[PDB]
């Protein structure tokens, strides 16, 4: 029974690092559990050489404005935009629809003809 999906094992990792931390003189033992890319894929990340992980600014230009957006609509309270709508717009813009090309559609239309045309070819090959 694996916590990660079968696909993700060859990529992902579960890192548990438990530390003693002091609080008001006492010591509480607190752990960081996290799911994380393996170091090969990690130095692929830090190299800016890695797919499946996309840079932020190519999604929407200049995050220095985007995360630093302070709300201006009829208000002098310059509080930042909330967390949830930023995460929401992020995961929306990630998940949008790509214009699948008719070329790939044509390759797939050729691939649909696999079995019928193969049987027709196998029948005429004798």
């Amino acid at each position: 029974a694996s916590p990660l999906p079968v696909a993700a094992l060859s990529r992902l990792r579960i890192t548990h690092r438990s530390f003693l931390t002091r609080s008001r003189g006492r010591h509480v033992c607190r752990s960081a559990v996290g799911v994380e890319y393996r170091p090969e894929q990690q130095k692929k990340v830090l190299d800016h050489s890695y797919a499946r992980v996309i840079n932020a600014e190519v999604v929407h230009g200049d995050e220095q404005k985007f995360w630093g957006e302070r709300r201006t609509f009829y208000t002098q309270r310059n509080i930042f935009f909330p967390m949830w709508d930023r995460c929401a717009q992020a995961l929306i813009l990630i998940t949008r629809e790509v214009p699948r090309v008719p070329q790939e559609m044509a390759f797939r239309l050729m691939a649909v003809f696999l079995k019928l045309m193969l049987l027709p070819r196998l029948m005429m090959n004798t």
């Binding site: 027709p120 029948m123 004798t126």
Partner: peptide
Amino acid sequence: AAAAAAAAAAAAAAAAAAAAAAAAAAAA
């Protein structure tokens, strides 16, 4: 599936060619 294969196995070469022609005309 087995009956169709058994029926096709008993057909001649000309019959198989005619069946192929019919399959090319109808289904293509």
